[PDB]
Design a protein around this ligand. Structure first.
Ligand code: GCO
Ligand code: GCO
Ligand code: GCO
Ligand code: GCO
Ligand code: CL
Ligand code: CL
Ligand code: MG
Ligand code: MG
Ligand code: MG
Ligand code: MG
Lengths: 414, 414, 415, 415
């Protein structure tokens, strides 16, 4: 048994660009699928696969998943980055898919078997003020979601190039207002870290008053404030007992978590942005987070994700893999096979899928009253209809939201 | 190109003694200006320039700014002090001014270009009680200031040699009273650290009640209390979410910040007094402050200030350079060129200038609704009219406020 | 006033090694910047990261705002801090510094603080199959005027190389290194013996000191080829030979082992040609775990971040030794040297000779005389590219072979 | 689909050493798993822990949920983390992995990541009464093709052994070791002299390096027989002889002393055949206090936790050397080797020869040729047990004598 062909498929059935890898073998009908999706970079990841990892694999036995991972990881010398890791993930997940197909077992059966019979999900809710958020959250709870991420506005702004309209809305509502900008300013999506941070604890006081303490509430700070203001936020949110506060610092600010954890008892999630062991390992070792957030394709696939899950397990840290819309259904299944086999599973973020995703990727997990139920089919239990995928070509482009500027025009980590 | 002459100009157009350096070259009309202002020491700084750095520079190429800085810094062997550093600053800023003039670009363009289109300012407000402070702050907000430093009284005293009158005013107002002094006591400006510290959180509760949470409020403890009482103050101010609490300890007490930062989430600013890397570096390394306050002439000018700004940047710490009245407009421009080019700019302290400063130093930045807008002229964009400067001779003398005594007569770091 | 009108990537290999170069055009006729994006093993992924993303991102922007462009380009794809991302950013950043110097009429070193020295001290590579060949090579470098010499015997791990992608030349393996026997079948790869390599090294340096003396400075690159504890023993065993530095005793993924190493050994340590992330380099510099920072500056994102790392090192007493072998363009060589001229903490500059084809394709390459490099005084990076001639040296591309490095039992090692 | 129908324990001693084996039957005719529970000194307490507790706990359960069974069996008695508890859990866990591979039609190494090497490197034991006997023994092992050799002189503490429970053979004491005199009466025990032992060791290794050279890798096991500070001195004194590792310089109860040792010595350190608890092994791996983790995998609870410890080690740059002397069944030997094949961080595999009786009772034992082991490719652990033949080798049982180790004054020492 050996690898005959490796290709990349770029498709966007859910309206978000995805990168999928298919590895073909010399056994008729036996192939594996993997997720490479770094949505902002699809063409650079495609090159990293098609021009490099693809020819590197031809003629090799797919059974040596670890040897392939280790040798591919260093094949370009330099390594540990989101383009390199996503390319590696596409390969690695496809090789696990093939191993499970060869075994006649789902990948979760190879990784230790089921530790639970359903995967608990959390979903996003939002709104422009605390009543809109309350109503959005209540509607998700009525659908059976028991864990809800609640966001309000866009980090103190409106998601536009100007703060004046939202500031006037805040004046009228008697709420905290964002700052006035200089008389001319650079293009970007303007926000206000100070108005945002000062507003957050009142939002959660309101949600607890209205929704109660049974439901689990989550909040994502998304690296939007200074570290000391995040420490203060984490402390201010303690009375509301959030399931977690996510990304209070940028990866480049991870040293500030030592101070945060000497002060706050709010649980902390970090790491959708992580690409490098020197980011995640010291946080797990030192108990500086309670949930590891990696986007598994950005750390290189199932092989490294299982290692990070175990490293976390032995430190008492749980998993919450990143899984919003920019992940393919193959990556959603990979997250959930790890989730099922991990003693330390924390929670699974979920973005509801449309009909097109379900038809382009047969095998998507079933969602019923806030839990996901993955199928029992071998490998990752997921397929791709290549002809129907080709009917959803990718948009490409440079996203606008990643130019995020504070009121004075300063570029911030978005 | 080489340095022909170096001179010091002592002038006080704003009523505060300034020390300015002018370096002339062999190119007609090309000269540079720098700020040496240590206002309490102008004659010692003048000597350190005129008798030492001036003859050291004659005939040297001004293009080697770093070589000149490093060699001047060690020229007297002993180093790292406010007289030595201010003399070095006058030279260094003038050399940057010449480099920008030679380039035809503002110094901010050499330091990485603009990161924002206006410089956010904070201004001082004060009053004898919480209503006076509220009114003073409101008047600055109406002028367009979005960041306000609020002080009340003078650290529990009246700014006089006796506490009895202010104590009686406090009795009548039903407020906390300063202590009675011994029956005879040494001359000085008496204050009361205990009355001061215990009064501060109520001041900010009042300002938040009246002014709201949109405006940013700052407070300067100015090394006036014991370290443990500063830790307690920082904690007590948390509910009021100050932009920062400044100088909770003296430079000689920097080891106490390790304890403060294990307890409080109030942001901390330190360092207008710093002269030495062994002061600022461990605080930045260990995340013990959120804003670095250096008076840039006291650390040796633009060259070291840019290094401290970068060292801070990579630790997540922002800049707030010291800039009250004892700084020349050349130093104000240098602060603002660093501010414009620093990703990590925090805030810029500002003391409004009179007509005399604007006429003696053509090129002062424009202030409009709480932001400063520096001009685009080459170098530091600033000049000095030597004839008009000579019409504002310096006062000199020993300031009285630096003899600060607690109620029992103890000299305190002022 | 100025604005960016076009951004393009040029792939060329005049020195036998694939390079990636960026050219940024402005609206001022004849004013353009050049930068180095060279991650040689990935040139097509870097080319995409520039052409499909950073190029359209820049069009119409004022090139004067170098820092605002660096910070915003760095986060434009959200995920960041990796070799393809950073090299693309470097090509942009260096070209913007080139434009700034040309606008100013000054070399980039003049914008960065001016000259701190009048020549840049170089170290060069010597190798050989045995201690005598290494000795003869080093003696020749000394005769040519080099005062700092890196000495390997069989390059990295003792394995030499058959892969032209590394140095553009085959290098013979260590001839007397007596590796352990492999199992009866084994996977394809370039085999080396870490134990035999580590033991060979103190003997090599004893011989070199015996024959060449202690005036010359001698360097060695362990190139992450041994376990951390064996690297600690090697650092200690080399102490009597007073190396200028021992380079890459650990992989980036093993940086936590340097705390132990530095409690034991006084041999100076260089690290970091592989570094892509602040969480790699910052703790080592903060904790005095290295004496020389080795970054390949395009892999950290260009001149803007390199200057910051040089300053962060300076304040910690650490010096600079930027990575500069064959896989760097002459644009990158000039950027290294402009930093070197303006840094008080300059340590040493690695150098491999630039052939005539490189010098023709890139007018402005530094002059080398008697162990020092002399950069010209022209504005910007003082370097140009002849696009027509660059096209005559199309890139080889492909997957390198030397990066499949296996120990005797067949284990993949970080190469 | 499958469910567990029977669980039993088999006690057998074909190699002259008491073994504990678990067999788990399913509802599918002919599909069963085998596992290793061998804590040789306690076989009857382990047998009870399986037969009276874990066996009834498992009946009717789906063997596919290996992790859920491990986690739940581990806590089923509340108290946990000890050698009787963990060995019982291991017998279950290995048998469930055996069943998983048989269900999949694949060796367990294929489920764990596949092969990272094509042979497993072995080290073997040499001993002797004096330096010349040790030399002759080691030279013979080298001639047979072994590249890694552990060298003792009088086994542990220099005392040799009269107890067949250790190696199934008497071993002569160090003949020239000149112990201190005991008091005029003393308690029964196997006497040894820690001071005379420690001093003998650097002399032994000087002689071996003089006679055998530096290509071969040499190992030594201090077996917790000396005080921590004397072990620190021994680690330092061995540095010139470049041992592959020095094993068990401290008892598990003395692990806090390794911080001091690692600030001083560069001799590589192996620890942990005695470990039963995460609070023993985790801090050592986190803090880089060892280079090789030595667990007896049945004493840590089987393949499930061993894979986790191997991964935790991998991310810390620590390698695996699983304990594998005579008191382990061939099932346990195969489990060690399946982990070894699939771990990037494999260090070395201890090996003691398996006699014909062991090979007959356990069909499928690995082949050994020229210093490497070759596991077969059959599904599961690739190992079986002939119950009829196993019954022909009933266990000896009893209390071992070698574990009463006393210093010259009569003090009980951790043996
Ligand atoms: O928690 C999350 O789901 C993330 O923060 C997303 O909101 C990211 O912003 C997005 O995945 C980037 O592509
Ligand atoms: O924050 C400030 O502006 C300072 O604390 C000033 O108030 C100093 O007291 C003065 O600059 C000394 O000369
Ligand atoms: O010190 C050096 O010069 C390096 O180690 C190079 O030899 C790298 O191996 C090469 O640059 C990789 O492409
Ligand atoms: O390294 C080794 O192989 C061990 O130290 C064994 O010799 C143990 O003493 C034995 O396994 C105890 O039963
Ligand atoms: Cl990358
Ligand atoms: Cl027990
Ligand atoms: Mg998030
Ligand atoms: Mg102050
Ligand atoms: Mg190197
Ligand atoms: Mg042992």
């Amino acid at each position: 048994l050996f690898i005959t062909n490796v290709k990349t498929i770029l498709t966007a059935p859910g309206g978000i660009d995805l990168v999928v890898v298919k590895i073909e073998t010399n056994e008729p009908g036996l192939y594996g699928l993997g997720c490479a999706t770094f949505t902002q970079r699809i063409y650079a990841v495609q090159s990293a696969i098609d021009e490099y990892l693809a020819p590197f694999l031809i003629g090799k036995d797919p059974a040596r998943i670890e040897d392939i991972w280790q040798s591919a990881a260093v094949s370009g010398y330099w390594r540990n980055g989101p383009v390199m890791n996503n390319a590696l993930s596409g390969i690695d997940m496809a090789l696990w898919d093939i191993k499970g197909k060869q075994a006649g077992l789902p990948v979760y059966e190879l990784l230790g078997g089921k530790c639970r019979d359903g995967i608990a999900l959390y979903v996003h809710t939002d709104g422009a003020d605390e009543v809109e958020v309350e109503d959005s959250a209540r509607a998700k709870m009525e659908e059976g979601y028991q864990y809800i991420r609640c966001q309000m506005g866009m980090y103190g702004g409106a998601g536009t190039d100007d703060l004046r309209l939202i500031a006037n809305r805040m004046v009228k509502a008697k709420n905290i207002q964002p700052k006035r900008s200089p008389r001319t300013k650079a293009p970007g999506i303007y926000f206000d870290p100070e108005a945002y941070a000062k507003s957050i604890p009142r939002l959660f006081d309101h949600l607890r008053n209205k929704l109660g303490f049974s439901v689990e509430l989550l909040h994502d700070a998304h690296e939007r404030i200074t570290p000391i203001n995040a420490i203060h936020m984490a402390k201010a949110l303690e009375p509301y007992q959030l399931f977690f506060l996510e990304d209070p610092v940028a990866p480049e600010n991870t040293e500030w978590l030592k101070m945060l954890r000497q002060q706050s008892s709010t649980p902390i999630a970090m790491g959708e942005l992580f690409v490098n062991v020197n980011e995640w390992k010291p946080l797990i070792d030192n108990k500086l987070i309670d949930y590891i957030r990696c986007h598994i394709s950005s750390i290189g696939g199932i092989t490294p994700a299982k290692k990070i899950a175990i490293y976390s397990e032995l430190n008492g840290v749980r998993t919450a893999w990143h899984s919003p819309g920019d992940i393919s259904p193959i990556g959603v299944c990979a997250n959930m096979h790890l989730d099922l086999s991990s003693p330390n599973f924390g929670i699974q973020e979920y973005t509801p899928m449309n009909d097109a995703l379900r038809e382009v990727f047969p095998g998507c997990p079933e969602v019923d009253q806030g839990y996901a139920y993955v199928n029992d089919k071998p490998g990752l239990g997921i397929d791709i209809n290549e002809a129907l995928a080709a009917k959803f070509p990718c948009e490409g482009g440079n996203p606008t939201w990643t130019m995020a500027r504070t009121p004075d025009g300063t570029v911030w980590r978005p």
